[PDB]
């Protein structure tokens, strides 16, 4: 199968993405202080194989090698994140000049190569010092985030015009505070729900902060990882369970940011008093200029009385193709979600801000990798995007996760999502077949 991209407008944005803690390394260099992920990596058993982000791809010291990869791809845009603990290391007060200078230089270099920066402000690396004050269970943290946004926007917002506030708040809140499998490893539904609230508040405050501080008007949006939630059977119990999952994973985030309040069925399900103050809902619903869709899989949901509060469990998806981390391959789910955002939520501009897959790579002695399953996954999901556009969805661009192999959080380095292979001992980056195919597809679309 070879995807046909001609229905996409010529101003479609072709991109690829990383995040700071997953690639940068240099965790104690040039004024950086620890984030909650630094701390989580010191907990025995938290990260598969005991991996850490101490070095990762060393992109703090090897940024030009990333830029060479980006030039090889020929992308229009690069989505990367700013490390909060590199810029305001304690999360309050003093700005760390060297940290901010690094990102200033990254922005200049991208623009010199004709690549637009798409900057994520919060990609999970909360400064540990703010976690020592309660972290996302402390409303103050949202105001700290807004202060940070204003510092970054004032510095970079003459050149950066496209901003993401938070990446995947579901992950921070539910997996970081309910399941405990991500930093800070808390396992408490009431804290998790309150953290979800203060995260959404931080998003709205950050929108306002950017519009106030950027020297040129920003385009700002939230990034949410969405998953179609479908019942394992047509029993009434399974149908309602899948709908509760849809609230938990999708509507909890989409509804209040769209001005629809928090969904009543989920408020009732959680039974947690939201830490709400007058005017908060209008802040959370701050007007945005796009929505960022991260998509990897749908979820098949069954009713499950053994799961406290939620009462549902995910079961394996039925498609034959699954990635190395057992994520079902289902490109139709991407088309559907793009359309839902366009039709059910009236989104005026949608980016796919993450999509990609992890497979077992077999590098040769020079780290060349031929990865036909990763390539085919890319091609099928691009075809799903094309079909959503043919059906009227305002899809403005696509960002492949990821530019290169990197630290995949609690799974460590084992899942390689890169279009480029990374030999971690040397930092050597070598484009895989998938990356070369992506470059060929971009060039073909533009011709």
């Amino acid at each position: 199968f070879m995807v046909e991209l001609s229905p996409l407008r010529q101003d479609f944005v072709w991109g690829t993405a990383t995040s700071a803690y997953q690639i940068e390394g240099a965790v104690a260099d040039d004024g950086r202080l620890p984030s909650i992920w630094d701390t989580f990596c010191r907990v025995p058993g938290a990260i598969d194989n005991g991996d850490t982000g101490d070095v990762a791809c060393d992109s703090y010291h090897r940024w030009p090698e990333d830029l060479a990869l980006l030039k090889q791809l020929g992308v229009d845009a690069y989505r990367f994140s700013i490390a909060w603990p590199r810029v305001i290391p304690t999360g309050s007060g003093a700005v760390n000049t060297a940290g901010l200078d690094y990102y200033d230089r990254v922005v200049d270099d991208l623009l010199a190569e004709g690549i637009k920066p798409f900057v994520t402000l919060y990609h999970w690396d909360l400064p540990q010092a703010l976690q020592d004050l309660g972290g996302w269970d402390n409303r103050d943290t949202a105001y700290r985030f807004a202060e940070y946004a204003a510092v970054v926007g004032a510095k970079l917002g003459d050149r950066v015009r496209d901003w993401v506030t938070l990446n995947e708040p579901l992950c921070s809140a539910w997996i970081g505070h309910w399941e405990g499998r991500m930093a800070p490893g808390i396992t408490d539904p009431a804290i998790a729900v309150r953290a979800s609230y203060n995260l959404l508040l931080a998003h709205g405050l950050g929108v306002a902060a950017l519009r106030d501080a950027c020297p040129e008007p920003p385009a700002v949006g939230l990034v949410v990882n969405l998953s179609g939630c479908e019942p394992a059977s047509q029993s009434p119990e399974d149908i309602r369970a899948a709908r509760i999952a849809d609230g938990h994973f999708n509507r909890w985030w989409l509804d209040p940011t769209s001005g629809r309040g928090f969904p009543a069925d989920m408020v009732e399900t959680y039974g947690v008093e939201l830490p709400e103050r007058p005017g908060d809902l209008e802040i959370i619903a701050a007007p945005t200029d796009f929505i960022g869709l991260n998509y990897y899989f749908r979820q098949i949901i069954e009713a499950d009385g053994s799961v406290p509060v939620l009462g549902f469990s995910q079961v394996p998806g039925p498609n034959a193709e699954h990635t190395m981390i057992d994520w079902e391959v289902h490109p139709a789910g991407l088309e559907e979600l793009i359309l839902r955002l366009a039709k059910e939520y009236g989104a005026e501009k949608i980016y796919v801000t993450e999509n990609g897959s992890a497979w077992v790579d077999q590098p040769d002695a020079e780290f060349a990798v031929d990865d036909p399953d990763r390539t085919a996954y890319l091609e099928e999901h691009l075809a799903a995007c094309v079909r959503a556009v043919e059906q009227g969805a305002p899809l403005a661009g696509y960002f492949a996760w990821s530019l290169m192999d990197n630290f995949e959080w609690a799974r460590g380095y084992a899942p390689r999502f890169g279009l480029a292979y990374v030999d971690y001992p040397t930092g050597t980056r070598v484009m895989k077949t998938s990356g070369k195919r992506y470059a060929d597809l971009i060039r073909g679309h533009r011709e």
Side-chain angles (χ1 to χ4, degrees):
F1 174 75
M2 299 161 69
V3 54
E4 175 61 67
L5 300 171
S6 58
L8 298 180
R9 288 178 51 87
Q10 278 303 306
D11 55 2
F12 192 85
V13 174
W14 294 108
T16 188
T18 60
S19 83
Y21 188 77
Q22 299 181 268
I23 70 172
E24 278 183 7
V27 298
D29 291 347
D30 290 349
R32 188 177 177 282
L33 284 185
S35 77
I36 58 173
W37 271 93
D38 300 68
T39 303
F40 198 58
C41 284
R42 317 299 178 203
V43 175
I47 315 298
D48 291 354
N49 303 305
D51 293 344
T52 82
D54 283 349
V55 180
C57 314
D58 206 20
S59 282
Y60 185 75
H61 295 300
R62 294 180 189 279
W63 153 246
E65 296 173 60
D66 298 354
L67 182 61
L69 292 176
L70 292 168
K71 295 172 58 61
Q72 181 172 358
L73 288 177
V75 285
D76 311 299
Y78 180 44
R79 172 167 181 249
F80 63 100
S81 88
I82 311 290
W84 192 350
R86 215 184 268 293
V87 174
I88 310 187
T90 67
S92 64
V95 178
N96 177 40
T97 300
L100 197 52
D101 287 348
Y102 168 76
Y103 300 111
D104 188 56
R105 287 186 298 263
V106 166
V107 164
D108 284 340
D109 290 349
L110 288 164
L111 291 178
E113 302 307 316
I115 308 168
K116 288 186 298 298
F118 270 63
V119 171
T120 303
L121 286 173
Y122 185 72
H123 206 122
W124 305 358
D125 48 333
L126 184 76
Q128 179 60 53
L130 291 190
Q131 189 63 62
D132 290 346
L133 308 173
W136 291 110
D137 198 22
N138 184 341
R139 182 183 176 96
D140 291 3
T141 302
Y143 291 90
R144 301 292 86 78
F145 173 73
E147 293 165 358
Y148 159 65
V151 164
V152 173
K155 182 77 189 197
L156 307 180
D158 60 325
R159 288 154 293 149
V160 180
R161 307 298 305 278
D162 304 277
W163 299 84
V164 172
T165 51
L166 316 183
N167 176 85
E168 299 178 323
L170 163 186
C171 292
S172 299
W174 301 159
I175 314 178
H177 299 80
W178 190 317
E179 306 178 24
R181 301 201 205 95
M182 295 194 285
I186 285 172
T187 57
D188 188 306
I191 297 178
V193 171
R194 290 197 302 268
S196 73
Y197 185 94
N198 290 327
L199 282 155
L200 288 170
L201 184 73
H203 155 74
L205 299 175
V207 173
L210 285 171
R211 300 202 193 282
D212 187 71
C214 289
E216 302 287 347
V220 190
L222 188 59
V223 161
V224 286
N225 53 316
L226 301 180
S227 299
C229 292
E230 304 166 4
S233 78
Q234 288 298 113
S235 72
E237 296 78 5
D238 282 350
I239 291 168
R240 293 188 302 261
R243 181 63 177 182
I244 298 303
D246 181 72
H248 189 61
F249 294 109
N250 307 317
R251 297 182 284 112
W252 189 252
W253 318 99
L254 296 173
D255 276 9
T257 53
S258 296
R260 307 181 181 184
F262 288 87
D265 61 341
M266 303 310 300
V267 174
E268 168 173 287
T269 295
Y270 299 143
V272 175
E273 183 179 353
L274 302 184
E276 180 175 342
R277 295 179 189 187
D280 278 0
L281 286 180
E282 298 93 313
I283 292 168
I284 293 170
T288 51
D289 306 286
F290 63 88
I291 180 72
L293 167 64
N294 287 7
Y295 171 79
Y296 295 83
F297 52 80
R298 65 168 165 190
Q299 302 190 46
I300 310 299
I301 303 294
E302 76 180 354
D304 191 345
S306 73
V307 178
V309 187
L310 298 174
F312 70 78
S313 285
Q314 180 186 6
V315 299
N319 295 353
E321 287 308 294
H322 275 68
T323 72
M324 73 164 276
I325 57 183
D326 298 321
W327 291 0
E328 178 197 36
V329 181
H330 188 55
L334 177 52
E335 171 186 353
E336 293 163 356
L337 282 168
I338 293 168
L339 290 167
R340 176 173 188 196
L341 287 171
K343 310 200 158 170
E344 175 170 354
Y345 284 93
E348 292 193 90
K349 192 168 208 172
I350 303 160
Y351 293 98
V352 173
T353 39
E354 292 188 16
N355 174 247
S357 58
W359 307 83
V360 175
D361 292 333
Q362 291 184 75
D364 69 12
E366 293 203 312
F367 313 121
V369 169
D370 181 17
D371 54 338
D373 293 313
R374 192 172 292 101
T375 309
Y377 183 105
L378 171 69
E379 300 183 314
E380 293 179 304
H381 286 76
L382 289 179
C385 290
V386 172
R387 295 195 308 268
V389 163
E390 288 170 333
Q391 294 169 75
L395 184 66
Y398 176 95
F399 290 79
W401 185 269
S402 178
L403 170 62
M404 46 174 183
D405 301 335
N406 58 66
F407 179 79
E408 183 47 39
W409 305 119
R411 302 170 193 270
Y413 295 102
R416 293 176 178 272
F417 277 89
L419 298 168
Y421 182 88
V422 180
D423 177 62
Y424 287 115
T426 65
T428 303
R429 303 114 151 84
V430 174
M431 200 71 72
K432 312 178 189 171
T433 290
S434 57
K436 292 182 281 192
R437 176 61 169 157
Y438 190 40
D440 285 345
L441 287 171
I442 294 164
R443 174 165 50 255
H445 175 250
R446 259 68 201 287
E447 283 171 359

